[PDB]
Design an enzyme around this catalytic site. Structure first.
Site, mmCIF file in Angstrom:
data_model
loop_
_atom_site.group_PDB
_atom_site.id
_atom_site.type_symbol
_atom_site.label_atom_id
_atom_site.label_comp_id
_atom_site.label_asym_id
_atom_site.label_seq_id
_atom_site.Cartn_x
_atom_site.Cartn_y
_atom_site.Cartn_z
ATOM 1 N N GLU B 1 69.827 -51.706 -48.397
ATOM 2 C CA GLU B 1 68.782 -50.691 -48.279
ATOM 3 C C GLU B 1 67.576 -50.999 -49.183
ATOM 4 O O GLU B 1 66.439 -50.905 -48.730
ATOM 5 C CB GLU B 1 69.339 -49.286 -48.548
ATOM 6 C CG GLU B 1 68.264 -48.218 -48.394
ATOM 7 C CD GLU B 1 68.787 -46.801 -48.496
ATOM 8 O OE1 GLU B 1 69.945 -46.603 -48.932
ATOM 9 O OE2 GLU B 1 68.034 -45.873 -48.142
ATOM 10 N N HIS B 16 65.480 -53.879 -47.052
ATOM 11 C CA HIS B 16 64.989 -52.890 -46.093
ATOM 12 C C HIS B 16 63.775 -52.135 -46.638
ATOM 13 O O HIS B 16 62.749 -52.009 -45.953
ATOM 14 C CB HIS B 16 66.128 -51.937 -45.726
ATOM 15 C CG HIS B 16 65.677 -50.645 -45.127
ATOM 16 N ND1 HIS B 16 65.462 -49.510 -45.880
ATOM 17 C CD2 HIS B 16 65.434 -50.299 -43.842
ATOM 18 C CE1 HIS B 16 65.087 -48.523 -45.084
ATOM 19 N NE2 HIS B 16 65.073 -48.974 -43.841
ATOM 20 N N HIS B 20 59.815 -52.236 -45.318
ATOM 21 C CA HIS B 20 58.951 -51.131 -44.906
ATOM 22 C C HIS B 20 57.541 -51.317 -45.457
ATOM 23 O O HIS B 20 56.545 -51.134 -44.738
ATOM 24 C CB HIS B 20 59.532 -49.802 -45.389
ATOM 25 C CG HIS B 20 60.463 -49.144 -44.417
ATOM 26 N ND1 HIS B 20 60.101 -48.043 -43.669
ATOM 27 C CD2 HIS B 20 61.755 -49.406 -44.095
ATOM 28 C CE1 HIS B 20 61.122 -47.670 -42.913
ATOM 29 N NE2 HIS B 20 62.139 -48.472 -43.161
ATOM 30 N N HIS B 56 64.261 -52.371 -37.493
ATOM 31 C CA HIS B 56 65.599 -51.827 -37.652
ATOM 32 C C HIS B 56 66.617 -52.476 -36.725
ATOM 33 O O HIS B 56 67.799 -52.507 -37.072
ATOM 34 C CB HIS B 56 65.546 -50.311 -37.530
ATOM 35 C CG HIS B 56 65.008 -49.694 -38.775
ATOM 36 N ND1 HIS B 56 63.657 -49.666 -39.054
ATOM 37 C CD2 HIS B 56 65.632 -49.236 -39.884
ATOM 38 C CE1 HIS B 56 63.473 -49.156 -40.255
ATOM 39 N NE2 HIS B 56 64.653 -48.875 -40.772
HETATM 40 CU CU LIG Z 1 64.321 -47.823 -42.529
HETATM 41 O O LIG Z 2 63.774 -46.174 -41.846
HETATM 42 O O LIG Z 3 64.849 -46.198 -43.634
#
Ligand SMILES: [Cu+2]
Ligand SMILES: [O]
Ligand SMILES: [O]
Ligand SMILES: *[C@@H]1O[C@H](CO)[C@@H](O)[C@H](O)[C@H]1NC(C)=O
Ligand SMILES: [Cl-]
Ligand SMILES: [Cu+2]
Ligand SMILES: [Mg+2]
Lengths: 325, 325
Positions: B1, B16, B20, B56
């Site tokens: 994450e 992750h 973003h 994703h």
């Molecule tokens: Cu995400």
């Molecule tokens: O996300």
């Molecule tokens: O996320």
């Protein structure tokens, strides 16, 4: 065997390095001295002298009047064979006599390198001041135009003093900071740091070079930061970093030549790295980079048997310099 | 994450979350134009961007390499002995449509000193569907009533090229529609489950105006406000339970796995209140109520569909969803 005599001996050995020695005493030594004649003058009882003499007798050494690069593995090995002999001499007459003998047998670039690191790393060299390399091998510090005027001055047998201008043109914004990397003293600083702290050093040569890997980081960090300060002074942005998968934006024409070997090569602007036969693939550089960053981000270096060496500690930066150089 | 539960963020970083930001800043990656962060840099806005789903799916495939590494489930892994799904049917047609929804924009505008509010609303068209009820006929021959977990997924039958998908090619595309725990009595009985009660979804939020009115009415008059009638805001909107489908209709596989509720809720309390959104949003202030891997039993490779077809407590049937434009 006093400092005056040792300095004079070094001065003589480095004089007119591309020609056979003009000093009658050094000619006599080069003719009659046997590096294997009295092994009691060496701390290794002649082991290093035997290695070098065998290479010499088998015609395996680089010829005189040929370019020399410390980054060339075999040429470095040959220079270090002479360094090893000088480094084993117990007394100055051994050091001087071996230097005189191999001056006349070995490539001049190898010889100058070995003699300099020999003086620096032997206690016998204490008190000697090495002449500036820009006067011992001026081709490595002087653009080809000025050397040609020197060649012309010699061909015509007329004295002169010739002005050196920086490389490039005013259209080349990088020329604004040529006074940094082209300064002859900055060049001597750099070569001498590496002579003091050589990547080939092994402690079997007699002593340890304290914190060498961290000093390797630091001296180059300071060169980089100092260069960027000159760029800032000249309305230029900081240098970008190199990356193996991106173009090298700024090319370079040295306009300099070897004494033997021809003109130094040029690099055009905006080129991608290509694999270099006999050296490495570009991809090999990326993998090596990745492995170093793996150690940094793991917090440990991996030993040959797989065990971990912690670098989350003050000597970690030194160990990194050891593995990166 | 990555999260603060990561045992080694120095080495593994934050793929992750950094992704973003990397994606969100691609309209101004060097900050030259002073643009603010992209929609990918807020959870409020990220799904507006098409690249959200490309990012994703990329991340999902990393997880899938891990989930694919385990051995396929066997008959003995999957069988809930003595529990057979005899029939799966839906009471009510599966129909989607668009309707209209309003929310206030008052908080977006500037109010003066001593300036009366005026009502300012936005009206959006939103997907919705008609209510329906699952009818799952189950035969319990165990000899006593048993807690069962009902796991309901919607799976594609063919891809956009009209190619019929194997179960292995369907499973990772299936969407979760429901998960619930229910005592199945001995014998043959039909379980009914309303679409409204899905543990995957929650209703539309009450408006700010409605919350103000209800709070104010309760405070004014000494009336105990109780809103224990509303749900959390975590959960797929009820209105989006079904995919849009096509006006001509599309057929899908409705996949039902009935699994051992005792095993699935061991160490918790199976027949207790788990709230309305436990499938993906868990239970506020409590352990996650289902011990099975998320996605069970579709989260491992199914190279041999015969294994699933031989399990009496798993059944899929064809359903049709029609969009009304
Ligand atoms: Cu995400
Ligand atoms: O996300
Ligand atoms: O996320
Ligand atoms: C070389 O430079 C010196 C001083 O730097 C100057 O006096 C002389 O004019 C220059 N020579 C030429 C040929 O430009
Ligand atoms: Cl019934
Ligand atoms: Cu250097
Ligand atoms: Mg050659």
């Amino acid at each position: 065997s006093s400092t005056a005599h040792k300095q004079q001996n070094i001065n003589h050995l480095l004089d007119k390095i591309y020609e056979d020695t003009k000093y009658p005493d050094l000619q006599e030594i080069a003719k009659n001295f046997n590096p294997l004649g009295d092994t009691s003058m060496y701390n290794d009882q002649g082991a290093a002298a035997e290695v070098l003499m065998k290479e010499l007798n088998d015609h395996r050494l680089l010829e005189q009047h040929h370019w020399y690069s410390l980054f060339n593995a075999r040429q470095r090995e040959e220079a270090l064979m002479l360094f090893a002999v000088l480094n084993q001499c117990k007394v100055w007459h051994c050091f001087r006599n071996n230097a005189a003998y191999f001056r006349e047998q070995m490539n001049e670039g190898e010889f100058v390198y070995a003699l300099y690191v020999g003086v620096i790393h032997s206690k016998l060299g204490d008190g000697i001041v090495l002449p500036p390399l820009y006067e011992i091998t001026p081709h490595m510090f002087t653009n080809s135009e000025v050397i040609d005027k020197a060649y012309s001055a010699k061909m015509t047998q007329k004295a002169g003093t010739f002005n050196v201008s920086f490389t490039g043109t005013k259209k080349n914004k990088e020329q604004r900071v040529a006074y940094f990397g082209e300064d002859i003293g900055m060049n001597i600083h750099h070569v001498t740091w590496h002579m003091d702290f050589p990547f080939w050093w092994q402690d079997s040569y007699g002593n340890h070079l304290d914190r060498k890997g961290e000093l390797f980081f630091w001296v180059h960090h300071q060169l980089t930061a100092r260069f960027d300060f000159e760029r800032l002074s000249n309305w230029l942005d900081p240098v970008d970093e190199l990356h193996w998968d991106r173009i090298i934006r700024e090319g370079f024409a040295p306009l300099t030549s070897y004494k033997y070997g021809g003109e130094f090569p040029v690099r055009p602007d905006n080129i991608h790295f290509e694999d270099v036969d006999g050296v490495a693939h570009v991809h090999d550089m990326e993998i090596t980079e990745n492995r170093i960053y793996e150690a940094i981000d793991h917090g440990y270096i991996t030993a040959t048997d797989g065990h971990t060496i912690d670098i989350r500690q003050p000597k970690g930066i030194e160990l990194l310099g050891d593995i990166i150089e | 994450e990555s999260s603060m539960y990561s045992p080694n963020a120095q080495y593994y970083g934050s793929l992750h979350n950094t992704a973003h930001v990397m994606l969100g800043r691609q309209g101004d990656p060097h900050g030259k134009f002073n643009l603010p962060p992209g929609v990918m840099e807020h959870f409020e806005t990220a799904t507006r961007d098409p690249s959200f789903f490309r990012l994703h799916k990329y991340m999902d495939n990393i997880f899938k390499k891990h989930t694919d590494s385990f051995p396929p489930y066997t008959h003995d892994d999957l069988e809930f002995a003595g529990m057979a799904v005899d029939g799966v049917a839906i009471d009510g047609e599966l129909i989607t449509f668009f309707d209209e929804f309003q929310y206030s924009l008052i908080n977006a505008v500037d109010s003066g000193e001593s300036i009366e509010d005026v009502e300012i609303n936005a009206r959006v068209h939103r997907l919705n569907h008609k209510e329906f009820t699952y009818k799952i006929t189950v035969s319990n021959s165990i000899g006593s009533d048993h807690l069962a977990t009902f796991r309901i997924f919607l799976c594609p039958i063919e891809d956009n090229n009209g190619i019929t998908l194997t179960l292995d090619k369907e499973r990772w595309l299936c969407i979760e529609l429901d998960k619930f725990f229910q005592k199945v009595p001995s014998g043959t009985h039909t379980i009914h489950r309303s679409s409204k009660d899905s543990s995957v979804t929650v209703p539309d939020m009450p408006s700010f105006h409605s919350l103000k009115e209800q709070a104010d009415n309760a405070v004014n008059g000494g009336s105990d406000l109780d809103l224990s009638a509303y749900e959390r805001s975590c959960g797929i909107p009820e209105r989006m339970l079904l995919p849009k489908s096509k006006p001509e209709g599309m057929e899908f596989n409705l996949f039902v796995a009935v699994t051992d509720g005792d095993k699935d809720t061991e160490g918790h309390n199976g027949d207790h209140d788990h709230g309305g959104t436990h499938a993906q949003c868990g239970v506020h202030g409590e352990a996650y109520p289902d011990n099975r891997p998320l996605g069970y039993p579709l989260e491992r490779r199914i190279p041999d569909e015969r294994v699933f077809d031989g399990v009496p407590n798993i059944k899929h049937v064809v359903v049709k969803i029609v969009h009304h434009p």
